[PDB]
RNA sequence: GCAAGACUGCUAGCCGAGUAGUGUUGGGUCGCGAAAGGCCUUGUGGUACUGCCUGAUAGGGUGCUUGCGAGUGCCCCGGG
RNA sequence: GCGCAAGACGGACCAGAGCGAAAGCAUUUGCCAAGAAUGUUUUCAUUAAUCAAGAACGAAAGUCGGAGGUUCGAAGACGAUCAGAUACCGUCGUAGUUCCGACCAUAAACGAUGCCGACCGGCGAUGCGGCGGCGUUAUUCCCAUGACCCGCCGGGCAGCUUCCGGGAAACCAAAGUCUUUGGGUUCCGGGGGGAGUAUGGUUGCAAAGCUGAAACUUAAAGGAAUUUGGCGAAGGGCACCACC
């Protein structure tokens, strides 16, 4: 079989993490890049490294990868978790309040609120899976 | 074999009892009463060595022979009465019951109701063997 | 937990516990009254009657013996009394 | 019983149940009630009826035991005996085997045992005869129409 | 030493139960100790059902099932490979083996 | 005697009429339940659905589709 | 396939469910007697706990005398297996297995863990009795009863979890509250073998049961756990110095 070694995989992962804008999907081109920007003591090791780099490009061009962090692929996560919507999902016109917690809230600090309503309780009390 | 019947209007129904054990198969065919039989062919009549009596091939050969004799006589449909050794010995049927039933199905007959008549007891009689059973 | 006010707890815990495991043991039973529409008399019976009780004048039956509290006859009103 | 010519006129001899349902109705975590009676019809025919009843698990039930007390089983069996005794003593053979084609006896058993404990599968497992009287040609002829 | 929390059986306050017999053997084993197996089987196996339904006169004929209960002595059970030995840490798993098909 | 409130049952013109019949496990003040005949305002509007049986569009069983898990379809009268 | 006759047993339902001091107890129904738990604002007032002497019960096997003996089956008779096989296996088969009456008091009679009583964490459940509550059903209204659901109390068979704690550890909510050593009380062990042996006593028709030494010999015999080890142990892979 053809299973890559920790040395080849580690070198390919770190050469993707350091360099990303100087590579591609063509095997011979980024083989020449990997020859130029690194020191590799053999031709066969260089070809194996460039092959795993091409496989890493084919993995990366689909979606996110859980082992490699790329600065061009970074800033997207904080782009998605920085912006906010106009509705805060906490200030509505109706709040689903049970009569039991309504009576609890009346005992707490209040007699009436401007945004609460009372629903009806269920007719049957079943809440657990049948196991005996 | 003969009578005023017609082969197109109706079909002749019989009842076949399949005794399957772990030593031999009894492919028996009776009438609708069950009192009087047509032909009784057993799995030992085909093979010569008794080790092949529990083989499915002997049950297939016996079932094919009794089925060709019965459809030569004029019985077309069969009701299945599968029965194991029974009693206190063994509830599981033998290895030749499936092969015998498939050979009856492929011979050109017809199959009606299927039921099992293994004689399960109401915990009656002490089993064969001692307290420690068979040692091997 | 570790800190429990065993001097005076909430009365739910005394009403929930056994009749002998409280700080001061007290029965959970009470004395009760029976009034019928048919007979114009009032009799005082125990909650756990454990016997057949007849009203004064032999008008109607009033109680039925059970394992626990008695089965009052249907149509009879009651209220708890204390001194 | 007799042949006139080329015809075998038949008569009732017993009722059985198939073994498949007999070992398919029995399940774990449920109980059984069985009753057997020696009742005789309004003619000279004596029957012997066997019955079996099982346990209904409710729809909103979380418990997997579904057992019952012993006195409830005795009361259910007593209801079974008085139902089976009451329903056949006023009738003859034709009416009881006409009733045997549906499960009206089983329906009355499972409807009588409703306030005691629910039952979900009630069937008459077996019918046997013990006493055979003198054969009558006219009764068998009227039994065939 | 003490191998199990119980004694390999299911009696806690009894002292004596009625004995039963093995199926492969004839060994007398107590009822709560023997490894029961209520197997659910039918008449034909996988591929004869098409031939049976082709030869069956009644259309949409439902097939019957065979219900037997099998009782095994533990030596005959292990020799038949229905139960296997487990590790010391994973012995305390009373959950049944998972069924899929 | 004063004074209005919160909740609920039946009916969809009303009186006949909750009278028989049926009904169960134990009862009750007991469920289910239509006319004969008469007087009128001469019959209040909206809204989805309906596999078969028992005992309601409820309750409890149990089906058909392609083998399973899940959709959809299955009161009747008609037309295309 | 239809019937008859005899004896034995009570399958599926049957579960880490119930009762009983223990040995043990499973077809429906009838009769007699007893008992735990629960309920009580009933009754007496310390009647209580453990126990030499003594007493009752006590699986199977074994003995005596009957009736009966279906199946199974010591001893025995053979056939194979094997170098030997009076063993595993297969076919017959006497006592015995079943019931009554009279014996003996032996088990891994084991939870290998004396009885009573106080304290010391949590959680999901199970069986019983009692208490309280939204709802569905025994066809539609009410109440009580049964059947579900939600919780509580008391006794019990258990289960999961925990760095309470203990132990040599396996493990135990008791085997904890133990050097910071004392709640009450009965029996019982001082390295291994000789030896549960010999004599004596007692009991028994008999077999045997209880009580129970000594000379001599020995430097270890053991309990828990760890690591390659070997399995005619199981689960996955490999090799023409293995096979097909
Ligand atoms: Zn075995």
UniProtKB/Swiss-Prot annotation, chain A:
Describe the protein's quaternary organization and the partners it interacts with: Component of the small ribosomal subunit. Part of the small subunit (SSU) processome, composed of more than 70 proteins and the RNA chaperone small nucleolar RNA (snoRNA) U3.
Q: Does the keyword Nucleus apply?
A: yes
Q: Which UniProt keywords apply?
A: Cytoplasm, Isopeptide bond, Nucleus, Phosphoprotein, Ribonucleoprotein, Ribosomal protein, Ubl conjugation
Q: Which GO terms describe its molecular function?
A: structural constituent of ribosome
Q: Where in the cell is it found?
A: Cytoplasm; Nucleus, Nucleolus
Q: What does this protein do?
A: Component of the small ribosomal subunit. The ribosome is a large ribonucleoprotein complex responsible for the synthesis of proteins in the cell. Part of the small subunit (SSU) processome, first precursor of the small eukaryotic ribosomal subunit. During the assembly of the SSU processome in the nucleolus, many ribosome biogenesis factors, an RNA chaperone and ribosomal proteins associate with the nascent pre-rRNA and work in concert to generate RNA folding, modifications, rearrangements and cleavage as well as targeted degradation of pre-ribosomal RNA by the RNA exosome.
What is the primary gene name for this protein? RPS17
One Pfam family name is Ribosomal_S17e
Q: Could you tell me at which residue positions the Glycyl lysine isopeptide (Lys-Gly) (interchain with G-Cter in SUMO1) crosslink is annotated in this chain?
A: 102
Tell me which residues bear Phosphothreonine.
Answer: 129
What protein name applies here? Answer: Small ribosomal subunit protein eS17
Post-translational modification note: Ubiquitinated at Lys-102 by RNF14 and RNF25 in response to ribosome collisions (ribosome stalling).
Keyword Transport in annotation = no
- Where is this chain primarily localised? cytoplasm
Entry-annotated residues carrying Phosphoserine? 112
List the record's Gene Ontology CC terms alphabetically.
cytosolic ribosome; nucleolus; ribonucleoprotein complex
UniProtKB/Swiss-Prot annotation, chain C:
GO biological process terms on file:
ribosomal small subunit biogenesis; rRNA processing; translation
Subcellular location(s) of the protein: Cytoplasm; Nucleus, Nucleolus
Q: Which Gene3D superfamilies match?
A: Zn-binding ribosomal proteins
- The organism's place on the tree of life at top rank: Eukaryota
Chain positions recorded as Zn(2+) binding sites: 36, 39, 55, 58
Ranges annotated as biased composition (Basic and acidic residues): 1-15
Instruction: Give the molecular function GO annotations.
Output: structural constituent of ribosome; zinc ion binding
Q: Which N-terminal residues, if any, form the signal peptide?
A: none
| Note describing how the cofactor binds | Binds 1 zinc ion per subunit.
Zinc finger C4-type: from-to:
36-58
The job of this chain, per UniProt, is described as: Component of the small ribosomal subunit. The ribosome is a large ribonucleoprotein complex responsible for the synthesis of proteins in the cell. Required for proper rRNA processing and maturation of 18S rRNAs. Part of the small subunit (SSU) processome, first precursor of the small eukaryotic ribosomal subunit.
**What is the recorded name of this protein?**
Small ribosomal subunit protein eS27
Curated annotation (Swiss-Prot), chain D:
Location comes to: Cytoplasm; Nucleus; Nucleus, Nucleolus
Identify the segment of the full-length protein shown. Answer: 89 to 233 of 264
Q: What is its main location?
A: cytoplasm
Which species?
Oryctolagus cuniculus
> What is the designated name of this protein?
Small ribosomal subunit protein eS1
Provide the gene name from the record: RPS3A
Indicate the family of this protein.
Belongs to the eukaryotic ribosomal protein eS1 family.
UniProt record, GO biological process: cell differentiation; translation
The record's note on quaternary structure and interaction partners says: Component of the small ribosomal subunit. Mature ribosomes consist of a small (40S) and a large (60S) subunit. The 40S subunit contains about 33 different proteins and 1 molecule of RNA (18S). The 60S subunit contains about 49 different proteins and 3 molecules of RNA (28S, 5.8S and 5S). Identified in a IGF2BP1-dependent mRNP granule complex containing untranslated mRNAs. Binds with high affinity to IPO4. Interacts with DDIT3. Part of the small subunit (SSU) processome, composed of more than 70 proteins and the RNA chaperone small nucleolar RNA (snoRNA) U3.
Sequence positions bearing ADP-ribosyltyrosine: 67
Keyword Acetylation appears in the UniProt entry: yes
User: What modifications follow translation?
Assistant: ADP-ribosylated at Tyr-67 by PARP1 in presence of HPF1.
Task: Write the record's keywords in alphabetical order, separated by commas.
Answer: Acetylation, ADP-ribosylation, Cytoplasm, Differentiation, Isopeptide bond, Nucleus, Phosphoprotein, Ribonucleoprotein, Ribosomal protein, Ubl conjugation
According to the UniProt entry, its GO molecular function terms are:
structural constituent of ribosome
Kindly state one GO CC term assigned in the UniProt record: cytosolic small ribosomal subunit
Its ancestry begins with:
Eukaryota, Metazoa, Chordata, Craniata, Vertebrata
From Swiss-Prot, chain E:
**Family matches, as InterPro entries:** Ribosomal_eS26 (IPR000892), Ribosomal_eS26_CS (IPR047864), Ribosomal_eS26_sf (IPR038551)
GO molecular-function term, one example from the UniProt record: structural constituent of ribosome
Q: Which UniProt keywords apply?
A: Cytoplasm, Endoplasmic reticulum, Phosphoprotein, Ribonucleoprotein, Ribosomal protein, Zinc
* Gene3D superfamilies the UniProt entry points to: Ribosomal protein S26e (3.30.1740.20)
Gene Ontology biological process terms in this record: translation
Enumerate composition-biased segments (Basic and acidic residues).
Answer: 86-96
Give the protein's recorded name.
Small ribosomal subunit protein eS26
What broad taxonomic lineage does this protein's source fall under? Eukaryota, Metazoa, Chordata, Craniata, Vertebrata
